[PDB]
Amino acid sequence: ASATRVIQLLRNWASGRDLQAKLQLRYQEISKRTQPPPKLPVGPSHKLSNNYYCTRDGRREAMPPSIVMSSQKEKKAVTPAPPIKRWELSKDQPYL
Amino acid sequence: HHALIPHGKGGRSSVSGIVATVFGATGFLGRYVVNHLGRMGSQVIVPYRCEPYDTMHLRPMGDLGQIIFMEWNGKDKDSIRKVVEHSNVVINLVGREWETKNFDFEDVFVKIPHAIAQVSKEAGVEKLIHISHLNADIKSPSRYLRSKAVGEKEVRAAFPEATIIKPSDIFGREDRFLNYFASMRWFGGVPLISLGKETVKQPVYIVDVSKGIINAIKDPDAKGKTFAFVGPNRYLLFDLVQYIFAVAYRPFLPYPLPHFAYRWVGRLFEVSPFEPWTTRDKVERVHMSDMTLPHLPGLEDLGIQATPLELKAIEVLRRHRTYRWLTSEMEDVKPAKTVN
Amino acid sequence: TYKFVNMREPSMDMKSVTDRAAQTLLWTELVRGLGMTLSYLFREPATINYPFEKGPLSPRFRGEHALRRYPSGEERCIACKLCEAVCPAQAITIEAEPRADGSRRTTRYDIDMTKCIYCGFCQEACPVDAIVEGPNFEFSTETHEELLYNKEKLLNNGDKWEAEIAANIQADYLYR
Amino acid sequence: VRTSPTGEKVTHTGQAYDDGDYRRVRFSDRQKEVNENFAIDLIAEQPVSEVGSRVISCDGGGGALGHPRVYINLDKETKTGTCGYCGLQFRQPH
Amino acid sequence: LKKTTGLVGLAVCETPHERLKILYTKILDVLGQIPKNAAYRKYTEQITNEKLGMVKAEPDVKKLEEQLQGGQIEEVILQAENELSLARKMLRWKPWEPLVEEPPANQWKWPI
Amino acid sequence: VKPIFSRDMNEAKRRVRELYRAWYREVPNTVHLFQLDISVKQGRDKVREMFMKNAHVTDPRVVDLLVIKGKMELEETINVWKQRTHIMRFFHETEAPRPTDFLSKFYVGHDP
Amino acid sequence: KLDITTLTGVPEEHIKTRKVRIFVPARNNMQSGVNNTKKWKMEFDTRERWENPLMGWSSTADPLSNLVLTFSTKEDAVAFAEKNGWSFDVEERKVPKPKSKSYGANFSWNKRTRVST
Ligand SMILES: NC(=O)C1=CN([C@@H]2O[C@H](COP(=O)(O)OP(=O)(O)OC[C@H]3O[C@@H](n4cnc5c(N)ncnc54)[C@H](OP(=O)(O)O)[C@@H]3O)[C@@H](O)[C@H]2O)C=CC1
């Protein structure tokens, strides 16, 4: 910024931080508005051979739901899934 | 010249086909007439003289494009021409209860109506509606009433088939007649010439008058017919004012007005460097019973039935109702005495 | 995986107790907040001097729709109605007839800027880059009717803003 | 841009309010927005390109900035081939 | 003894093993009244017996929590109470009975 | 068929009677609180008309459902959840009369 | 005798004065696909459409102008119409009659089916 040294010292002491290092206002550090022309890459399906849509047709591979039980026509107890594992306290900062 | 086929269900978006130019649309009657035209989907070419801010309240009444606001000059006739050029119906509501400096009673009741009628005829306007009080007459003592009669004759002269409606006292939410009496309580006591014992009044409801105008526009037979709008019942001035003060629940302080004794009060009102408290002609209107003109057709001829004042008085005068009735709900009041 | 906010126990030693008693009695934390506000007072304000200074915008900005022309001057739109189909708010009404030259052109192209949501569709759908939301954003009107654009209004907007619109498209046409 | 008998500026679509029509009132103290540039005149003014191949391709210029590429047949000597999108005209020499 | 369970509204149980034993025994007693061939009875008995065996075998709260994989042991006792209530209502509902009614012809056909 | 609240038409009629009672006694309070300009008799006449609108119903479940809706509307009116606009919506004041004779319909528009 | 008319909230004019058409939509003759002809459709009667004065857009006052419903079978559509108290007209499904196609017939020795080209 354009602040005088005295004002910088005062604002930094009031903050308790060095505000000059990280300034909310943006200066020349921002990217240039005009940029060199881009050339975006093509995807996996841009091939001239072995690219039949039948192989990569996602939608046509969906199927109607499978019917596990239908009313209209020992065994171990089971759960919807294995029980969730307990989370572990973060190493970087366990307590804020 | 400009014939439009009606389309739609008569709603806000429907095309009624009545392209109209409501002069004095910003007025108490205009506020309702425009509303009805818009709800029918009638294109209303509103001529204004004031700031657009004042005309802003008319904007919501019509759909997009239905309401066109164009400034017009009261004296200049080219403004009248441009505002009636593409109109099949023109309604004349240019009345000033008091007399202004620039515009006198004659200016607004003879020259302006006659100019409008003449220019409407030049443009080819199919139907014209003119408004003049039933009391207004070529011999009526009130100058404004006399000017209204002269303008009525001139309007008939310029527009032979114009439907000149002749309404009685009009009351409504933004009335100047009922509200006048309600505010007389502020003015010391209740001034009552002859205690209002010689002034029978027949007030018509504003909505009834507006719908009457609209139906007259719609009905073919209305052309070249001097309609007269009369109230459902006739009341003595004392009775009406008493009922007003009852529904308002304001302390009735009726002191009669001796001509000479209260003439000094009227002179003081005139002495004011501003207008003589809405002129003395308004007080003359108060000092006059409604004329009974049964020969002229009435509301029922158009099919609209006049709504009784008693039912609509509560709505009109609840605004003047204060903590006087808010804190003390008590009960309601009784209908005014009907001199019929 | 998870972190405990709060869940901290204050020390009970006499020094810590004295410090916390000082904070309560001497309003230390309030003074810290006050100092923060003071520092922000001495920092440079972020206000830009509108209208003399304008906020940054990118070439892909979506503003007032503008029908464009070919360099020859012929109007680009070819009455495909693809824009009307994708329009998520049905703000585009298109009518077409074969014109005298025999080309497929639009007799009516109305964009109701009161129903449009400025989604950016149509600009990405039109096969001929006809309707292209221009850079203009300050086109407020005093009446509702002014915002119901017509084909003449859209073409006038395109003619007015073509210098900027062509440059913005040139900037962004490779990303599309 | 021709002017109608009422004095209105007729549009490139040919739209003009008739003297009987009441909708002309909307321009009483305002203006009717008409684009002076007419597409048909400008597309007419463009010179007809002469190409020596039976089939030619018009992209409208600018490559991806124009219109979808179409191939135009120019065998007919009587009539010039016209681009469906661009509207430019081409014909074989002689 | 943990200071807090960590979840508000859940308090540390001073005697977790005894509470769990009592709750599991009450669950088994309620399940006894359920008919023998009811699937609910069989599965709940299996789970309850496994839990009770683990509870009796392990004397350490942390090890028991690791073995049960039911979260903190207070959550386990809450879950046991919930199971007790479910079983008590199941006795009234009798879900083991056959289906009340077959659905209409195409009540579950999609697309229509 | 499972009954909503009444197993027979008579019981539904009893519920209708209760709802009518409640609306009837509520009407003057509505007029006073909402500062409506209608008379109490006018409102009660509208109530009667609304109740007779559903009279043709000949199924107990439909009657019960209508009663539920009536109760909800009455609760709204008893509270100030409904505004003066909502209360007056019953009185189609703004809407112009729609003629019902054939000749008037033929004149006005193409509608059947 | 199910009647939901009171509960639907539809105003009486559209309940009484509207005729609903129950049909299987015919194939768009421009295309040979038939997938759009496999489900019954319920469509209301057409009403007046007029031009808006301002822009010329088609304005309507019929709330059910765009309402169309899909039903698997004719009976389901009929039941829905009856429960809603709408007068209904049912158009029977039109199926393409079986045709006899022979590529050999294009080269008949004596019959007229021989193709010139
Ligand atoms: N009791 C009643 O209301 C009765 C009414 N009438 C007549 O009904 C008509 C309308 O009544 P109402 O609406 O209540 O009256 P208002 O006085 O409330 O409004 C009359 C209108 O006249 C316009 N006006 C007045 N003088 C001029 C002028 N010099 N130039 C342009 N415009 C002018 C006003 O516009 P602006 O406000 O901008 O000046 C206003 O819109 C009037 O002609 C009145 O005399 C007759 C009998 C009874």
Ligand code: SF4
């Ligand atoms: S940006 Fe507006 S006009 Fe364009 S497609 Fe989206 S909604 Fe329609």
